[model samples]
Target: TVSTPIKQIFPDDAFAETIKANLKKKSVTDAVTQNELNSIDQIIANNSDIKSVQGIQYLPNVRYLALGGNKLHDISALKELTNLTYLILTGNQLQSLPNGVFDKLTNLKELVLVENQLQSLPDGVFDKLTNLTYLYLYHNQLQSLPKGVFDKLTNLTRLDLDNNQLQSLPEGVFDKLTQLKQLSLNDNQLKSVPDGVFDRLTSLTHIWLLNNPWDCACSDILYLSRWISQHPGLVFGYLNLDPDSARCSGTNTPVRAVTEASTSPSKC
Candidate 1:
């Protein structure tokens, strides 16, 4: 029987070293064959100083790729990894991503981009990720998201955007996330959310809205206030205060009871 010859050489030195180590190659100069690449389906290269994902395209069958705690700023090669179901890129330097990078990852279920420097996400970045269930974007520097960013994530159950710099959210941003059960917006700069933003999230039973600078006097706060009051079972750091927990800026009024200011437009 004849076999394919070894020819491919990994472009990134660090990445190549990792593959050699995983493949149990004795010499760093040894080249990995296509058949060998196809034999592996997962790469645990965390904290390996892998600056670029240049060699990932060779592993077409890899379903789970963990490249967290590295120096990756560009992952365009990941576009070729169509079979990826779980991708962890936590603690990277990815401030931005190229367009159409995730378009082919339609079967992806969980995507973790936590602790990055992502300032913003491109519109339709996750449009093709229909099967996505859990997405973590916590501890980033994102200030805002494009309108209808999550319109296609219907199967998502958990979406974490905690500890970002978001001041406001686009209208109907989460209108399509009906299946979402856990949502976190804690530690943002939001004063209030757009009305009906959380209306369509019927399956949401756990949400984190603490540490936001909520201006409880505004009428825009009414919907969230009422939503919080109505969803009494929603957890907020332990004890769920009724109609009075998360306070207003100066008056120190509970966000749920801010309805008192609604009667007076001057205060609202």
Candidate 2:
């Protein structure tokens, strides 16, 4: 039986030539000015179909990195892109991210993980990304979030958790995200949104809760409906749902249907 060596796992010459072709014949330490780095927006390498992505560490000064639609799996090499503010890892074969892999990317503002196969993320995954503003986690297989997984995303303004297998959201997960403006929880298996999940989101504007097995109980009905009415900025979904319909169906009585139409049929 023969096994491949890690050193020989990747075509170093091809990857290196690609990197050097973008930058000059100088170490990253010798490069000065954003102008120099601007010339090397040349090594984007998305959809390249490389098997190993071990050379990313060499470009530590890069601020925007896009390496999507590839056969590569391990991404521990990306931990060194501390200056990254924009990242795109869409349409990849990644299942999970290595823990603490993004710990150094404190300046990251936009992180897109769309169209992947992520199941769950480690706690404190976004601890260092306090400056993150937009997070796209749609189209994955995540069932639940680790407690405090979003504790550090205070500056976040937009979030999408749609098209996943989320049955329940951890309480206090959005407590720190006061600046959140838009959120999507459509197409999941949520029964009811637990109370106080959006307690501190004062800047919240729009929320879409369509196409779920929503079973909003009487208690959740009053709280959410009244809260939605009180917050002037609170807006409706994008599915063209009846603005007053509440869009929630099933055994858990619709608040308006129970109150206005037949009181006892949905009496709580």
Candidate 3:
């Protein structure tokens, strides 16, 4: 499918001609033959204090991308790359993402936004990535996720949300994640969660949740705790829990267990 091309902003005619020639080839052209093909197919520009990423938008048939450890705030240029299946923006200076920045990337499978300065995600931000499977948003400054934020990502298998400032997750957050297999929720400021939050996630096998103050006296944690007690095959921290972590019925313990637990498996 021929999609819209990135708008060219060349300094001179010679460079523009060359860039135009580069964009006329097939998607699977030999990467070894064309020196420029490597950057086009998989952008590995990490830790160079990258400048002018606009240049990369023009590359034809680009797919995977990694642009970590930079000082970028504006990623509007990435909107033009619709063929992207894998995207990484870790350790950058991003404070917030513009709406519809990923609207065209329907084929996206994995996305990493770790170690950035993002404070909050906009609504419908990921509504277009219906094929998304894996996501990593660890070590950020996010306070909360907008409702329906991940509603379209029905194919998700793994999720990481550790090391953030979140106190509450979106209501019915994981209800659409029928294909989810693994999840992480450690080291956040969660005081409680929506009741019956995890009732629909029967496919989960791995879960992580520890190091957060648990107020399971009566609330969402208690519901989660009871659910854990029902499903005993869940794994966490790479091991099975000992029933007691999610034991918030009358305890304040926390467990960073992966999936299910037994009678309240060891709370963290």
Candidate 4:
């Protein structure tokens, strides 16, 4: 198989040309040679604030790109790098991705967008990247995800949505991701998860839901907890239920023991 070329941008001008030339001859699958690449692991902006390198119009062999620890507010400059497979943009000030920002990078597999100021994602932001595998959107200001935000990523394997302000998720959000292995939803303000949220995710092996507030006395929650307990292998072991909360019957007692007792009681 022919391997794609890897291209990268650096903050300093010491060996930019030399690093580009050396990476051109190597295949994408080959291990990166740090010495030849001049240790240009990070790309900084001209204002010492990390400008977006996606504006560079003609880099064909780039694979790994890092624009983290910068002050870039937009990602419209990145639409040209069609060969990129791994992109890291953590700790930036981006509020939202421009329309079709990811349309050109069809080969992208891993994308990290943690610790940004994103309030909401535009629809079809990820419509073109069919090869995407891992996606991280933690620690952002995202209020909600547009329905089918992840419908196109059929090849996705892992997804992380921890530490956000998401109140609820659309029905069957993970139904199409048949190959998904791990999902994280810890530390959110979810009052409850709808029934059949995990019905289509048969391949799922782990689920994280620590520190989410729920109405312990609600029958819906009682049922959901029972369902999870029966599927021990699919739930994270460290997950703890609030024991000192109101029970479903309105008693001011811990619901942990009550939930366990209600299991297998034939109540739906």
Q: What is the TM-score of each predicted model, taking all chains together?
A: 0.91, 0.77, 0.76, 0.72
Question: What TM-score does prediction 2 earn?
Answer: 0.77
lDDT of 3 by residue, 138-256 (tens): 99988899887878889999889989989888789988988888888778877667777766677888776665565554334555655666665574553565444442323445432
List, residue by residue over 96-171, the lDDT tens digit for candidate 1: 9766679999989999999889999998999999999999999999999999889999999999999999999999
Candidate 4, residue 63: CA error in Å? 1.6
Per-residue lDDT tens digits of candidate 2, residues 129-233? 999999989889899988888778989999999889998888778888889998888788776566778888888878766667655444445555555556534
Residue 3 in candidate 2, Cα distance off native in Å: 30
Per-model C-alpha lDDT, please? Answer: 0.83, 0.69, 0.69, 0.66
Task: Give me the overall lDDT of model 1.
Answer: 0.83
Stretches of candidate 4 off by over 4 Å are 1-48, 237-268
Lowest-scoring 10 consecutive residues by lDDT in candidate 1? 1-10
Candidate 4 global Cα RMSD:
8.2
In terms of lDDT, the poorest run of 10 residues in model 3 is 25-34
Q: Estimate the TM-score for candidate 4.
A: 0.72
Candidate 1 segments whose C-alpha is farther than 4 A from its true place: 1-8, 238-245, 251-253, 262-268
Model 3 clashes, total count: 25
